[PDB]
Amino acid sequence: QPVLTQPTFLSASPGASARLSCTLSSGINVGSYSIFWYQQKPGSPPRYLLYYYSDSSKYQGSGVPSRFSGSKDASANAGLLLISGLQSEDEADYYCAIWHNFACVFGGGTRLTVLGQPKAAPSVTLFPPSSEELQANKATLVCLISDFYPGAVTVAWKADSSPVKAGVETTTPSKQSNNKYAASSYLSLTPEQWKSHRSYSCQVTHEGSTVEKTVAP
Amino acid sequence: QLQLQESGPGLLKPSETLSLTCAVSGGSISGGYGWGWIRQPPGKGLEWIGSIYSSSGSTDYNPSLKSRVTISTDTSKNQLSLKLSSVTAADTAVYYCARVQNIVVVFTIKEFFELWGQGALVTVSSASTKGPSVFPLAPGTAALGCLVKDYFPEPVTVSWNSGALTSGVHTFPAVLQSSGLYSLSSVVTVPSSSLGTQTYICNVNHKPSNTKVDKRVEP
DSSP, X not given: OOSEEOOSEEEEOTTSOEEEEEEEOTTSOGGGOOEEEEEEOTTSOOEEEEEEEETTEEEXXXXXXXXXXXXXXXXXXXXXXXXOSOOGGGOEEEEEEEEETTEEEEOOOEEEEESOOOOBXXXXXXXXXXXXXXXXXXXXXXXXXXXXXXXXXXXXXXXXTEEEOTTEEEOOOXXXXXXXXXXXXXXXXXXXXXXXXXXXXXXXXXXXXXXXXXXXX | OOEEEEOXXXXXXXXXXXXXXXXXXXXXXXXXXXXXXXXXOTTSOOEEEEEEETTTOOEEEOTTTGGGEEEEEETTTTEEEEEEXXXXXXXXXXXXEEEEEEEEOSSSEEEEEEEEOOOEEEEEOSSOOBOOEEEEEOOOEEEEXXXXXXXXXXXXXXXXXXXXXXXXXXXXXXXXXXXXXXXXXXXXXXXXXXXXXXXXXEEEXXXXXXXXXXXXXXX
């Protein structure tokens, strides 16, 4: 099995401490390895945090707050990344790494969730087809969904009052920089279909309640 | 004060050679410990590709990739290079260049990736590049935007007013359509009172097709 194992997910409370583990497989002693830690937020390159070998041999990455520290758990054969005073902004993927037999070995990464974020309804903006698209004999309705929490929605479309399932493409929700979620849905129509109805609606359901936006030719 | 300026994203056909460069600015590619390359397939974890050391010119490659990898530097161009031959779809990834710093531990010297380039998504596919069609989404805050339809491969970047406008901009992650092409939208929220006097232009760059479109969005 891989030399380094990290839990896929970890949740922790704001203001408390997060304890992220990097477990070395049996046959490899954690006492013998320097453990390096990297943090990665969406969109951006990994950031070196710190390394820890022992209390006498460790060093902090440039610009990394002392909230982040390293340690080892001998009985669990694991390196630890400890984050105190946990902030919402600390939500990220964290990778451990060691050098082993001349190679840089990365753990699979842990995605850290910081608990206690409030429920939030989606903001929905719906755009009709542009004149330019219609002139190209195409039509796309654009439904943009933002700032919702937790990160799950379902989207349905209506032509007047009738369900439309064909021509719908919807993204999975993705975490925004503010830790809320975004998604979008696109309905492809012919210009004739667009012009032949009184209206179309995008209907976004989140936690059992629905927000609907309507546009018309 | 060094910074790494990495070359851009693009598409390769299987069997071709990937070639990326990184220009060092703000100082010299020499005089430090070394340089390296790391990659990350979309939605997956980090994988080290290899490193090169400045004093010796010696290299250390990931053994699973060694037969295909060449990392080198050119001092006159202040430039770091990666070549990876005979690519397949398994090589689709964001590739990062990085500066390597050594650290004295107890029994050994070790090293870490101290400074990183921004990444370049290299996609390996039999499909052809396709540049996006860009349409304006016409608008007290008002929302206006741009629809970036039917492109391949990722990525597309969108700025507004040549990057001058950043407040209230939300560029959404792309949808992957059943056709295999991507579409995304970018929306900017602006004062509604400004609409008659302020020009709004979305700048849509699709580097893998060397194509950028600047679309005026009007009421």
